[PDB]
Amino acid sequence: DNYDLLIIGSGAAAFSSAIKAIEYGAKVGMIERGTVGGTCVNIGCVPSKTLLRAGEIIHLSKDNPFIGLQTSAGEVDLASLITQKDKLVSELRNQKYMDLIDEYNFDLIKGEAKFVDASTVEVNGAKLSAKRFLIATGASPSLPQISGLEKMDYLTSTTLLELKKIPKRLTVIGSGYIGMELGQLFHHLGSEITLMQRSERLLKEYDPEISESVEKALIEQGINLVKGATFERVEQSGEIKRVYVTVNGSREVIESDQLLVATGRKPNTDSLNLSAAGVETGKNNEILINDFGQTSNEKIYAAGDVTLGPQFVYVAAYEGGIITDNAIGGLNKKIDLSVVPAVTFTNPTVATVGLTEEQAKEKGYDVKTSVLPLDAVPRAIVNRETTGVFKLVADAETLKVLGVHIVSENAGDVIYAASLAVKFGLTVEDLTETLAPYLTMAEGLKLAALTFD
Amino acid sequence: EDNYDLLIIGSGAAAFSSAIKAIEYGAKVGMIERGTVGGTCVNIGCVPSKTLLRAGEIIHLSKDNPFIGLQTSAGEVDLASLITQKDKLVSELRNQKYMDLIDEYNFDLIKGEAKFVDASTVEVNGAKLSAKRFLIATGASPSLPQISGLEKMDYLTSTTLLELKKIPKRLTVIGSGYIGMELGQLFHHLGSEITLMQRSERLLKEYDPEISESVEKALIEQGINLVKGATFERVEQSGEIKRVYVTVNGSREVIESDQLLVATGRKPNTDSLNLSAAGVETGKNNEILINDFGQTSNEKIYAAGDVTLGPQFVYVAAYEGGIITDNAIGGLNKKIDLSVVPAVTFTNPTVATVGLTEEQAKEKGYDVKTSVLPLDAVPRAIVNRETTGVFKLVADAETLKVLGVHIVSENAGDVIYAASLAVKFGLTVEDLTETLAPYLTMAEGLKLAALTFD
Numbered sequence: 049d050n051y052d053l054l055i056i057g058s059g060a061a062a063f064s065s066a067i068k069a070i071e072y073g074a075k076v077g078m079i080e081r082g083t084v085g086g087t088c089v090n091i092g093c094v095p096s097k098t099l100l101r102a103g104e105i106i107h108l109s110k111d112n113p114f115i116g117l118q119t120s121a122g123e124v125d126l127a128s129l130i131t132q133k134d135k136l137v138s139e140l141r142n143q144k145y146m147d148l149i150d151e152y153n154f155d156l157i158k159g160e161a162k163f164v165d166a167s168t169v170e171v172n173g174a175k176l177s178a179k180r181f182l183i184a185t186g187a188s189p190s191l192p193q194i195s196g197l198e199k200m201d202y203l204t205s206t207t208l209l210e211l212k213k214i215p216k217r218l219t220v221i222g223s224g225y226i227g228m229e230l231g232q233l234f235h236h237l238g239s240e241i242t243l244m245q246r247s248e249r250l251l252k253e254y255d256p257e258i259s260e261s262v263e264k265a266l267i268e269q270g271i272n273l274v275k276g277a278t279f280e281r282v283e284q285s286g287e288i289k290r291v292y293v294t295v296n297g298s299r300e301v302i303e304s305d306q307l308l309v310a311t312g313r314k315p316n317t318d319s320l321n322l323s324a325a326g327v328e329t330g331k332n333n334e335i336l337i338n339d340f341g342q343t344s345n346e347k348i349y350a351a352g353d354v355t356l357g358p359q360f361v362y363v364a365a366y367e368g369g370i371i372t373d374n375a376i377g378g379l380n381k382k383i384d385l386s387v388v389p390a391v392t393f394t395n396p397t398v399a400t401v402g403l404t405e406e407q408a409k410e411k412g413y414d415v416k417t418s419v420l421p422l423d424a425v426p427r428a429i430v431n432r433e434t435t436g437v438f439k440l441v442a443d444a445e446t447l448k449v450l451g452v453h454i455v456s457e458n459a460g461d462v463i464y465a466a467s468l469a470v471k472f473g474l475t476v477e478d479l480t481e482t483l484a485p486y487l488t489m490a491e492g493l494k495l496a497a498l499t500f501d
Numbered sequence: 502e503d504n505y506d507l508l509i510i511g512s513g514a515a516a517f518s519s520a521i522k523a524i525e526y527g528a529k530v531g532m533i534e535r536g537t538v539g540g541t542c543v544n545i546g547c548v549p550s551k552t553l554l555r556a557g558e559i560i561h562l563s564k565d566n567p568f569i570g571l572q573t574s575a576g577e578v579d580l581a582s583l584i585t586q587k588d589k590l591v592s593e594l595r596n597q598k599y600m601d602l603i604d605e606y607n608f609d610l611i612k613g614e615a616k617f618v619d620a621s622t623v624e625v626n627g628a629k630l631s632a633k634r635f636l637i638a639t640g641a642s643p644s645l646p647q648i649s650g651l652e653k654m655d656y657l658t659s660t661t662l663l664e665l666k667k668i669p670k671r672l673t674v675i676g677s678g679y680i681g682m683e684l685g686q687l688f689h690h691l692g693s694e695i696t697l698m699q700r701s702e703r704l705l706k707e708y709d710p711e712i713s714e715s716v717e718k719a720l721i722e723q724g725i726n727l728v729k730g731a732t733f734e735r736v737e738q739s740g741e742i743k744r745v746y747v748t749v750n751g752s753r754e755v756i757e758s759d760q761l762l763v764a765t766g767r768k769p770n771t772d773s774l775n776l777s778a779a780g781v782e783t784g785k786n787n788e789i790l791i792n793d794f795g796q797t798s799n800e801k802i803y804a805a806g807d808v809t810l811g812p813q814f815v816y817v818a819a820y821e822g823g824i825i826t827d828n829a830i831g832g833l834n835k836k837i838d839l840s841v842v843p844a845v846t847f848t849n850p851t852v853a854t855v856g857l858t859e860e861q862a863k864e865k866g867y868d869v870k871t872s873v874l875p876l877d878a879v880p881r882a883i884v885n886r887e888t889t890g891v892f893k894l895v896a897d898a899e900t901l902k903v904l905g906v907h908i909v910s911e912n913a914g915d916v917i918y919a920a921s922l923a924v925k926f927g928l929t930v931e932d933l934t935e936t937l938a939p940y941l942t943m944a945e946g947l948k949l950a951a952l953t954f955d
């Protein structure tokens with residue numbers, strides 16, 4: 049048919065864009081290669097986070113700092129956790145399916161799509177035209193270029209979350225947050241974990257205090273780390289042995305029962321034949337867009353993980369809505385990602401919003417930093433867990449908050465406030481003027497703001 | 502020609518805050534403490550209640566959780582260990598509070614009970630002391646109700662219960678406030694049948710209806726017994742193993758218990774002060790009256806903290822202490838701004854309020870517009886498999902500015918801080934929709950609540 053807007057994808061960006069597009073009264077189509085919903089609902093956020101909740105519960109049941117308690121944690125039936133998880137993602141995706149019946153405008157086309165023309169695509173054999181296109185194809189697990197991994201029984205973020213047999217030992221190869229979250233997940237479920245990465249600092253992109261802190265907590269909990277490693281080759285023997293490579297000038301090997309690969313996530317632009325539609329691709333295989341989400345083709349827009357931006361679901365939905373506003377309705381709204389929060393749901397949780405110290409220096413600010421150890425926050429003390437940090441990056445001249453970086457329990461709830469401070473230009477003085485609830489983690493912010501001479 | 506520049510009666514949050522801010526001005530100050538240094542929050546109040554609450558939450562999650570594959574269990578609790586460890590923690594913490602005894606080498610710790618004998622002098626331990634300025638940060642103490650028989654009875658208070666080292670098989674709580682809820686749920690999670698009794702027909706009468714209904718639903722779901730709308734007539738005791746209660750809704754009923762906790766209120770400690778000898782006004786509820794600057798009827802006597810029967814929180818006490826010091830020392834005529842005070846009831850689910858309720862905003866004259874979001878709509882609550890709560894949003898229909906936020910959810914005390922920033926600095930619901938919210942966090946609820954306006 050001659051659609052008004054054709055969407056390649058079914059993720060958060062595809063859904064936000066489809067809704068906002070039907071609001072304008074346009075006939076739209078949703079082309080999905082596989083299972084509807086995208087990554088976050090089925091193989092991404094939701095499963096990881098619910099399983100992480102279970103793991104945190106059993107971890108507190110097995111080892112807690114309070115003496116009088118007589119708690120214990122037995123062996124885990126992972127099959128049950130995974131089946132219940134799948135029931136939850138199915139229920140949730142079903143709560144997302146209210147958009148097929150309702151919004152009775154858009155048409156669900158199932159199949160792999162490829163571009164054949166500047167205005168038409170081909171899927172499952174048939175051709176489809178449209179006045180506007182949205183490429184919200186997302187990203188998929190990326191692989192490293194290390195010997196032996198080719199023919200090997202390795203797991204990815206998606207495959208590990210299907211495993212129904214707890215490995216006695218799991219090795220993670222990844223510098224990102226997914227490797228940490230899944231690693232700690234299986235450590236709390238009863239498994240000796242070994243994190244391996246080439247970067248010499250845990251979470252290389254964060255501030256030094258954050259890396260040192262989260263690393264200290266991870267080592268304290270019992271996760272083994274292998275930093276600064278140079279990966280040469282990996283081998284497998286009878287599905288009951290693994291391998292590793294040199295580190296710090298000494299050839300070492302790490303045998304494991306399972307191997308997880310968390311290198312990165314590559315955009316799914318290969319099968320699109322973007323060159324047949326005049327859509328430029330970047331050095332990292334992404335899709336290039338302008339401030340309005342428009343590609344080199346005037347009537348093809350892109351949003352989500354496929355555009356190498358902050359690979360988060362909320363950014364994907366935001367970008368979808370804005371892009372739709374630009375393509376349909378003409379409203380020239382720019383994509384504002386100047387303040388995007390990031391949460392690594394380990395315990396202690398890592399959380400960032402705004403600029404780091406090095407980033408604020410690069411931007412040209414006259415930076416003033418204040419670092420507060422978690423043992424200074426009352427809530428961390430009464431909880432008898434004080435491994436963390438609150439970092440505050442401000443402008444020494446105007447006192448405006450440029451960035452907040454936290455390592456503490458449920459820090460994902462605190463950085464929202466920090467976001468409000470950064471976006472709306474609140475000063476540290478403002479943070480001291482506001483009353484903070486005693487024995488909450490948010491109090492950390494105030495206590496960090498009370499660190500300027 | 503006097504003994505001190507500023508003399509403080511008390512050692513609580515207000516006393517220390519005022520001492521710090523006063524030494525900053527370079528003034529000779531004194532701290533008169535009747536008993537144990539640190540005040541209520543460190544020794545008998547916040548810190549103990551919340552650390553024990555943390556333990557109780559841990560054991561409760563160990564005994565009952567919604568995730569199937571987990572095989573966790575929780576045995577009988579050794580309360581003695583929890584209480585001794587608690588005391589070790591408050592000792593460590595008060596010891597960290599002593600850093601002000603040397604870092605701020607100005608103030609002098611005088612120990613003894615003080616009473617006023619003149620408009621400008623006090624008496625402690627026999628000796629008299631003059632000062633150009635006075636701060637009455639005497640705090641509050643557990644109050645008792647007017648019900649027959651409780652006078653001669655082995656009842657517990659907020660301070661005594663935190664010392665109990667034997668888990669009662671059944672504990673009855675008499676209180677409409679948050680302390681009763683916190684301690685009640687604490688001992689419920691420690692393995693004890695709890696029964697909350699109050700005269701108000703709605704849990705937390707001052708909060709919004711949805712908040713009361715929700716938190717009540719969670720308490721009943723957990724297994725806490727509630728007795729609302731009760732008229733308290735008499736209570737009896739027999740051999741330290743039996744208790745009593747009174748009629749409710751027109752049917753005389755009785756609640757037998759192994760222990761009885763009283764959380765009615767907290768009376769200011771103004772009796773032993775002889776304020777009438779210094780010309781300091783007291784209110785109908787035995788409090789100390791102050792103006793907008795914290796100044797009493799006596800020009801050179803200020804007051805701050807719980808004795809000033811205002812929002813009875815430690816952060817409000819410290820704030821009031823600092824401001825009062827600014828007024829008395831330094832002359833700066835700064836008013837006490839309590840227009841945005843957060844409140845947290847650290848039960849699970851946690852209750853959290855900041856700003857105006859719906860009825861309060863209507864009374865103030867606003868054209869109110871509310872948005873209520875059930876907790877089962879928040880992703881983080883869903884993945885956690887605990888969805889008993891609510892997000893209520895009170896806004897101004899004209900300017901869309903956020904007037905108040907009220908939440909019932911896990912660790913909601915961390916979220917309302919954001920809400921505070923929204924209320925204090927006049928952010929609109931549209932502003933909350935413009936901001937990107939982290940997925941699978943409870944703070945996201947705020948955004949989801951802002952996305953409910955037609």
Ligand SMILES: Cc1cc2nc3c(=O)[nH]c(=O)nc-3n(C[C@H](O)[C@H](O)[C@H](O)COP(=O)(O)OP(=O)(O)OC[C@H]3O[C@@H](n4cnc5c(N)ncnc54)[C@H](O)[C@@H]3O)c2cc1C
Pocket residue numbers: 056057058059060061062079080081082083084085086087088089091092093096159160161162184185186187205206226316319320351352353354358359360361362364940941
């Ligand atoms: C383990 C894990 C944890 C994560 N945790 C978080 C988190 O905590 N917070 C967070 O914000 N983000 C998280 N993410 C990332 C998040 O899932 C993504 O940022 C988000 O889903 C992006 O949405 P999207 O629409 O852009 O792409 P996607 O949601 O991935 O959707 C892509 C869809 O496009 C389809 N498709 C692909 N190629 C084609 C083609 N050629 N033709 C037709 N259809 C095609 C696919 O079948 C898929 O359904 C996580 C990811 C993983 C793997």
Ligand SMILES: Cc1cc2nc3c(=O)[nH]c(=O)nc-3n(C[C@H](O)[C@H](O)[C@H](O)COP(=O)(O)OP(=O)(O)OC[C@H]3O[C@@H](n4cnc5c(N)ncnc54)[C@H](O)[C@@H]3O)c2cc1C
Pocket residue numbers: 486487510511512513514515516533534535536537538539540541542543545546547550613614615616638639640641659660680770773774805806807808813814815816818
């Ligand atoms: C169980 C419980 C839990 C609580 N939880 C919280 C919470 O979570 N958050 C929160 O914000 N607040 C909480 N509070 C309240 C909080 O502790 C108080 O509001 C706060 O301590 C008030 O500080 P203050 O200095 O005004 O009074 P206080 O801290 O009580 O200080 C009073 C001091 O004055 C001294 N004094 C009294 N009379 C005399 C006299 N005649 N002469 C000399 N000295 C005298 C006493 O020795 C005492 O040390 C809680 C209270 C209780 C009981």
